[PDB]
Write an enzyme that holds these catalytic residues in place. Structure first.
Site, mmCIF file in Angstrom:
data_model
loop_
_atom_site.group_PDB
_atom_site.id
_atom_site.type_symbol
_atom_site.label_atom_id
_atom_site.label_comp_id
_atom_site.label_asym_id
_atom_site.label_seq_id
_atom_site.Cartn_x
_atom_site.Cartn_y
_atom_site.Cartn_z
ATOM 1 N N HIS A 1 -49.584 -37.075 -1.704
ATOM 2 C CA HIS A 1 -49.766 -38.161 -2.664
ATOM 3 C C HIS A 1 -51.009 -37.851 -3.482
ATOM 4 O O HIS A 1 -51.844 -38.728 -3.719
ATOM 5 C CB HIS A 1 -49.955 -39.486 -1.936
ATOM 6 N N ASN B 1 -45.319 -47.773 0.224
ATOM 7 C CA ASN B 1 -44.587 -46.844 -0.610
ATOM 8 C C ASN B 1 -43.566 -47.650 -1.401
ATOM 9 O O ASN B 1 -43.542 -48.873 -1.315
ATOM 10 C CB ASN B 1 -43.870 -45.805 0.252
#
Ligand code: HEM
Ligand SMILES: [C-]#N
Lengths: 499, 499, 499, 499
Positions: D72, D145
């Site tokens: 990420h 998420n």
């Protein structure tokens, strides 16, 4: 012709036959024409960034120092080996215990606790006795003290404790108030305090002291039977302590006393040795113990749980380069191969985390890659990759995920941990009142003699005196609860010191 | 089947053969019993601190990343050799040229410039062509681009340049205002800006481009006579560049196009290569030269300064583990063996400091100890010690001071710097207007032909058009200075672009 | 009741009274329910990763330590102000000296040298006396010592020097063979070695003691005329040293002797102070002057260059939190505001790099962002961004490339550095012979009286008597090279020690 | 005039109308004379180390980069506030829900998963959606998420998973074999793989996607009553995703499409928001739930566990300096204040360790002091001290040991964790077969319509076609296990692709 130690370079120049010396180079390997006079413009002009010979060495210079150990900063190390003399395989299926005559190279690092890198050996403090067993199932680290007990029994108070024995956040000076305000509020230390201020307080060198894994561990044979144990590696050079007097003399006369005693010993061919034993406790008995078999502030009476000899711990070579081989060493209680496991000992549990943690910080993420720390008698292969300062080939071009269909490393089910059962709520269970006197009382008037019983009470008062009066009492109170005498003697002493 | 690059694992498992999967161990070398399920109290209970297999693994993953190179972040690497085809020894005595045929192991890293680790290879940008010679006189790092010139002539403007070329400090996006506002204010960039927006702005892979040392250098022979020189390593694969549409396509179709093209070629005995040349110049000539011979924005016309063939650059090996061998590769322009020395080039001068400086922070104080960076051909012997993550023996117990009287590493008069003389007021000389049009003018009319000039202007206008009107004005103005038509042509496009 | 330092916590509480204690929280601010008992399943159960209260505290504790200074580890620090008392405006245009009465906040850390963080304060070793001036033109760091000269005159010798005074690479103990071997082969140290082994070797605290800028510097006035000078700040508490035995017992009695003294003095209102002086030498004189005026092993005699008064150094504040305010303290000789500039000192120049370089290593890239290092009485605005542990706002959305047309920070011509001329080949000039005795002889006789002269020779032999004879000879040879009796007397002493 | 982001510097220049440019200084605050010309030798002479302005800036530039998030890495951030809209005080006693209307500042960072910092925004990949609530009770990091489930269910597979999702260790290219070899062997992924390859895999910016806590958590009310839950914060801008077509166009036309979009939207007052709902499963129902309730690869059907409105997440403020406020940003799932605890979710459990663990490395030991990460809405008081880059006052001269009798911080009993009971053997329970199809089948047959299933298999087969044949077998095989039709359609496509 001084001692072996002082002749360090002496012997080096010699053994270096008469072969010319290697050529002085830069980190890159480019030979240096002159590394004594900086590159300047004129005989009295400024310096040139162009003198990369300078920058190269200076640069390295500014980065030699690394953070010292949070605790146990001052110590010595040496290498040697371990050897089996008894068969305890019926107790633990560990590869190091294979069969008799089964050797294993080791590494060891003695040390104090509170004192920084500049500190001196010869002073009251527990001692660090750490052994690294480079076994076939990976390295085994038995990180132990010169005592079978510790001051606290919950990892949550160690940070505070260490802070307590270290410096004042403001003055940066030692502080009795801190020391004793902590000990006074936590009588669980009573047991170990008594051991610290006893004759053992200051061992004469590292060679004349006993080793202890301290914590309660777990053994498991190749048959899946597990049993609790306690390691004990007693010195073969006999126990020898140092008078409060000598200690303080050596303290400043030769701050590194304990350091060279070890070196010269091994140099003069008089290698040190300790006999490894282990106590044993079945799960049955463990459920019976009058206390918590996992309480770090307790011991297993030798009468009820006798020491079984297992092997010989021999040290016979001294470090060639202190930094690389000793300062850089890493001992991780979590490093236990198939056969040895930890117990629910709340302190051990914590150490399972703190050591590798701090190591990653003090040394670096890939520190296990440091020669001294690398398990060279094992084949390290897995799915871990990269990281700062990644040495080696980093496991080449091997599949880096598990599972995989490309023949990368598989897990040996024969090493699975030992299954136990626990029933209960997940909570913060208070162990602050798990008896802090019993075993202590039987240590004052039992393990010690009236002669050394008085020396103890003296040693203590000579330090507790400097603490605020409100602290002094609460303190005596505890000692009082161990035994009115073990508390009155100390008090009396204080009143005199106290003027 | 598929390409060699894509068949990475397939081939690995086959070579692996019928062997047995190594036992999966912790970083400590302990076998894992099941690295697929965590240790929990119950099949649906908490995770236990006691699971050191997890943490051992987890903790390493968390530390996998190191800072990417501040510039030239995206790149591909390959190892090979350098073979001497001629005798240039009459100029430089570097043992890397010693005798014709003498092979010198090399390492190479190709890269872009602005884009970070995840960016694409097929984007317009200069290209990195670093060559590491593992010689017997330490390492020789020749850090060159695919262009012979650069955007600026004073290090003091590089940090700023790279800033304008990267992301906006707040939006984190590419900024045409930063790009052009800077370039416009510094016409000295006009030369390289030209070469950049030309067909050479995007070469088709690394195998189809030239490598230049850019900076002016120095060569000292056996007699101690020196000369200024330029390095040139032309491609044997022929100059092949990519179109905006194809480079723009590959940008998304395959962002790692260069890394792949290169892996595959080498993997199929299709080793790329480059002939190495050099332009030799005398201090007397450098005296006469019409331009600042050390000015990074200028070239040494082949006419007056013909190139001399030196040897060949073959890359016949692919990196096994990319991170350990490529990501960690570190080239320091200051690593010149005896025989090669820097030049007063301001730019280069600054680079002497930066590479090892940043290498210390990206990799670590002991980076030169990384296998790929270690000068394994020469023998490193000096008085530098310690530093974090110390591998090897830290020169064991040899003396750490110099001079000493115990036969420790010595100087090397032979490998001394060639002395040059300079005179003048030590000050900050404004090198801002050392003519930034003359050589660009030739590039524009003599080097390029009409169709290429056409592209150069659309390529420019297509990007410049996004900067503010005022920048565009200033920007165009600078172009007209190189040539009236250059300006007008670009100007023409902008007005169109500004719909 | 006891000293101010001892009652640190006592007072902290007393003043904190009439207040409810803060709620114990995590590094993230979440209140902790119980920080004395870890989280486990069942009273005798294993520790749960769940216990994040634990990991938070432990992980942080596991990282408390940062690398100690490579030199001058053991130190103490305080805060005060500088007051302009005299006008030396005609010498320096430096805002710090602007007007009479001008107050500028300062910070200072005194220290020993070779010994590590745990070493004792009172031992033969020079004393660091660094002063940080937070001026409006940025900070100015006067990294001085308690002596006006140094053992060597070329940076290249320093890493090696320091190694000698430190520990043995293998036995890790202090080594007189290295000490002397170095000093023997390097006589220029004579001047300082004498001063060192003199009575001044062990000043009392950090007060009574003098501070010297040591190196030669440069001063520039509002009219570009530069002049050379030496900084001097004499103690207002009169030079007072410790006896060998005295200081020898305090060594173990109270190793933090200095720390205690300095803290209590300030704490009780007894703020110490120093008067700053400058010796000025014109470029003309610098020319005629009769050894190198930039040699660090030489001193300007008040005879021809008389001490001029400048201002007062007052320390009236103690550090609240030592680590935060003293440990992390970073001084950079390279931090010199307009009016003050380096001098050709080969020694100095080198320091111009080592200090910031090592600070970025020991403290981190953004170390100037640590409160006590920040130039808070100024306005740091530039084109530097990011870096680890970046505090503030990273200078917000401001343009980050120079030049630019967006109102970003513009440079000030005024602050331009004074230009000097330097002719002569750019090479490594040998300085090993620049008279390492003249001045030295004037100390032994003129400065030193028969009394101190007796203990000087005695102190030298007392230490030197531990090194091989072949060294002792070279050592006595240089001393007698200063004056026959010097070494002659030493020699006598030496022979008695050798039984 | 362009988009609000394009004119960043324009509005900055404009911002300070009037105001005069600050003076360009070094890091120390020293004003700079000439920031464009280095200090050389003569107009064509060498560089002088004496030049500190250069070195100051260069050395910093050389350290700007810090490790990018292990995963990420490429993201976008913003700040806004959280507002309570419904009283859920019967489930959680957390102060952040303290009462309708109450607003709490928040910080959010969006992100892809695999690509490094150079990567493109519009690519199939889950999407990170992290929220930081600066609540009075310390910081609360909800690390969600854009999907409510995940590929794996045991943390030990995570490093592996991520690895297979990134580059090849040797070629450094994305490996389809790696990707599908891993997914094929771990069928629990099917659920996520199916969701991932559905239209939801490539959202249209960060504003048109839902955010999910994913893991089950434990809410605790004022009566100590507990309940499990799942957090859901649905976009108020409507779920809008990109097509595999546009997404590929944007991938090269605007690799920062998400970055740019978010900024602009906010810059133009068009603030995005999300309604925060939660699901509630009582301990009873969690007992008879048809699947493991703490299994990350499963969901709680709205039907039986309806969503419940809590409040709104609104973002109305862009970062001023991306680095300082976004790149340095850090979220720790562990940061949960009183009334918000973790579930036994095996995945969540491993996370409590990894985030802080990794942050201590990427940012540094004291990263909780970085402004953006500091819980500036609470008072951090504890017994933690030192560590590198220690800002603030390091809690000053406060007592550093707990417990103490000096009024330092105390633990608050009302912040103790809700006690839950667990019983079972402590072992490595195998959850590999905990049903990896039921829910998947529902998603395929009920949640998606034909048009969709078609795109999904096309999207799956699109990538899968590249893996070796034996891998395609295994994979299709697993899909058939979800539904015969599911695997066949993919197989048909595979049959096609493969010529
Ligand atoms: C040319 C040789 C010298 C070099 C290369 C050098 C290098 C260093 C280095 C790297 C440090 C550690 C700085 C830090 O981590 O904060 C240091 C500290 C120190 N040095 Fe220098 N040094 C030199 C000579 C001396 C002399 C000649 C003096 C006396 C005026 C001196 C006074 C100090 C002081 C006072 C400190 C500690 C400052 C503090 O933090 O309180 N050094 N030196
Ligand atoms: C840097 N190029």
């Amino acid at each position: 012709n001084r001692d072996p130690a002082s002749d360090q370079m002496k012997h080096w120049k010699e053994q270096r036959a008469a072969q010319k010396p290697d050529v002085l180079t830069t980190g890159g390997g480019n030979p240096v024409g002159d590394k004594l006079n900086s590159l300047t413009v004129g005989p009295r002009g400024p310096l040139l960034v162009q003198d990369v010979v300078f920058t190269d060495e200076m640069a390295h210079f500014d980065r030699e120092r690394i953070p010292e150990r949070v605790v146990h900063a001052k110590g010595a190390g040496a290498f040697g080996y371990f050897e089996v003399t008894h068969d305890i395989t019926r107790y633990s299926k560990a590869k190091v215990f294979e069969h008799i005559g089964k050797r294993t190279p080791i590494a060891v690092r003695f040390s104090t606790v509170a004192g920084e890198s500049g500190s001196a050996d010869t002073v009251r403090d527990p001692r660090g006795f750490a052994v690294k067993f480079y076994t076939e199932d990976g390295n085994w680290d038995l990180v132990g003290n010169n005592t079978p007990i510790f001051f606290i029994r919950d990892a949550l108070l160690f940070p505070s404790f260490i802070h307590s024995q270290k410096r004042n956040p403001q003055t940066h000076l030692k502080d009795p108030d801190m020391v004793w305000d902590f000990w006074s509020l936590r009588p669980e230390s009573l047991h170990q305090v008594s051991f610290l201020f006893s004759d053992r307080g200051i061992p004469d060198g590292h060679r004349h002291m006993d080793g202890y894994g301290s914590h309660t561990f777990k053994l498991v044979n190749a048959d899946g039977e597990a049993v609790y144990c306690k390691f004990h590696y007693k010195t073969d050079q006999g126990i020898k302590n140092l008078s409060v007097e000598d200690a303080a003399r050596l303290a400043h006369e030769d701050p590194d006393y304990g350091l060279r005693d070890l070196f010269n010993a091994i140099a003069t061919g008089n290698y040190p040795s300790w006999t490894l034993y282990i106590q044993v406790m079945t799960f049955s008995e463990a459920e019976i113990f009058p206390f918590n078999p996992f309480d770090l502030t307790k011991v297993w009476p030798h009468g009820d749980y006798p020491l079984i000899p297992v092997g010989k711990l021999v040290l016979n070579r001294n470090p060639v380069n202190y930094f690389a081989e000793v300062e850089q060493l890493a001992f991780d209680p979590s490093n236990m191969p198939p056969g040895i496991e930890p117990s629910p000992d709340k302190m051990l549990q914590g150490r399972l985390f703190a050591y590798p943690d701090t190591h990653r910080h003090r040394l670096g993420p890939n520190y296990l890659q440091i020669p001294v720390n690398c398990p060279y008698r094992a084949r390290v292969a897995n799915y871990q990759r990269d990281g700062p300062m990644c040495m080696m080939d980093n496991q080449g071009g091997a599949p880096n995920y598990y599972p995989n269909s490309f023949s990368a490393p598989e897990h040996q089910p024969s090493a699975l941990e030992h299954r136990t059962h626990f029933s209960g709520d997940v909570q913060r269970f208070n162990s602050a009142n798990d008896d802090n006197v019993t075993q202590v009382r039987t240590f004052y008037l039992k393990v010690l003699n009236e002669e050394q019983r008085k020396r103890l009470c003296e040693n203590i008062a000579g330090h507790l005196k400097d603490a605020q009066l409100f602290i002094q009492k609460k303190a005596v109170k505890n000692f009082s609860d161990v035994h009115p005498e073990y508390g009155s003697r100390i008090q009396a002493l204080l009143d005199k010191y106290n003027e």
